[PDB]
Design a protein around this ligand. Sequence first.
Ligand code: A1IGF
Ligand code: A1IGF
Lengths: 230, 230, 8, 8
Amino acid sequence: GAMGSMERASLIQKAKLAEQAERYEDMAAFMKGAVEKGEELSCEERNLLSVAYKNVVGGQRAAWRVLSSIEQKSNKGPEVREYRKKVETELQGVCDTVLGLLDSHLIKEAGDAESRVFYLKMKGDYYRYLAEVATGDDKKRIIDSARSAYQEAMDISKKEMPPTNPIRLGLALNFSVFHYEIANSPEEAISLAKTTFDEAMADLHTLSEDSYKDSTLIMQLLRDNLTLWT
Amino acid sequence: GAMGSMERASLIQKAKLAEQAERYEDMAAFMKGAVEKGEELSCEERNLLSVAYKNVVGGQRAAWRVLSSIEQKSNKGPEVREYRKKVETELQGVCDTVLGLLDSHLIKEAGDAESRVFYLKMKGDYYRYLAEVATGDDKKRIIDSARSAYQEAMDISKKEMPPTNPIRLGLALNFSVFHYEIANSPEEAISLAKTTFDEAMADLHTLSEDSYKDSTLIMQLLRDNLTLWT
Amino acid sequence: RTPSLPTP
Amino acid sequence: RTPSLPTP
Ligand SMILES: *Cc1ccc(-n2ccnc2-c2ccc(C)cc2)cc1Br
Ligand SMILES: *Cc1ccc(-n2ccnc2-c2ccc(C)cc2)cc1Br
């Protein structure tokens, strides 16, 4: 509703300004407005959407963890639990908003492999965040929703993108984190990270200097996780 | 209104939790709720109020400056100006909220010199922030409101507090910044900072180790400004 | 927790 | 701009 009266181009322009100003809540609201205009997003626009929401939820997740840790150490009255709950609900709300944009209608209109993989990666990531705070049975269906999104993205990426494609690499990095941190599957995590690294290494020779820089940055983050996990 | 149903003690407890979680907007809302309970604030509570709002407005001010700089370099369509205006209005709103708490009724009920100086310092600081974004004639009355608040605080502090008192030192630091950055009075700024530093130096011998640490920290910040200004 | 992808 | 007082 709220951005309904602003031009799509103005929303994108303002999202970029908000990024420069480190006003990520505003950035996210601008990009939501832009998505709700109903047109497909370009590559640059998808990146703006992703940056905005990653910063918003990243703050929320960091606060949630601080509060959860205090709550665990308490096990005073109801305040820590209440405030943890408040932050958790706000986080769930942001995740639901993102998931709702993906479902209405970014994924369904995404035909090119790069756009489709991008959005399905996002869908996995935001179900993963919901999983981090979920408890019990809804927890299982949330975890399976994340897994299903990542798996669909992986299947498309393997068929349609080079092993060095940054989106493909990032997806593999995040799905490997899903396996290690959420699914209790450290061996799958390690396998995925190693195979992804090795297949990218083998394709580096095909890259220009600028593409090489991007691919190798992500490869280093895969290696960093492998180091931590072994 | 919004925190009206929560216990004062719960509000303070949650403000501390929000500080730990780096959730300063929440912190500020909790402390506003606590002030609106109508009781005086303790020393610790005053510090929580101040930390909360300084972080909120500090983010806004940083964003405003980024946007103002882009706007100045533009001198495209109305978007930069519009978004700068949006951030500016939000900032003015926070400042007005703080000033409204001070006026209803923190200053009037503050009898002890330390509490009164604390609140009048705050009043100066928040009129100073309003001055940073003001243009023309309201600008003059805003600047005079800041000046008047700082001056009243200085007069009380000189009569009632030692020259090493951290509140007294901080007030002098901020009033000196007011002179340099807002009032176009660099010589007054330098004078105030030097005299404050020298009078504190002369009283350090009276201090315990813990008090010494706090006083000397602020003295170093006065010196740092004097270095920048000369 | 393990690091996931940062922003570009 | 000149630095003012930081938080304690
Ligand atoms: C999920 C995802 C993966 C890759 C990128 N991306 C596009 C262009 N460059 C990158 C990149 C490069 C290096 C690093 C460390 C991260 C991202 C965007 C996204 Br949302
Ligand atoms: C305005 C103001 C001044 C001083 C303090 N304060 C109280 C106790 N300790 C401090 C302090 C000490 C060192 C530094 C660098 C800042 C503040 C609080 C406040 Br709001």
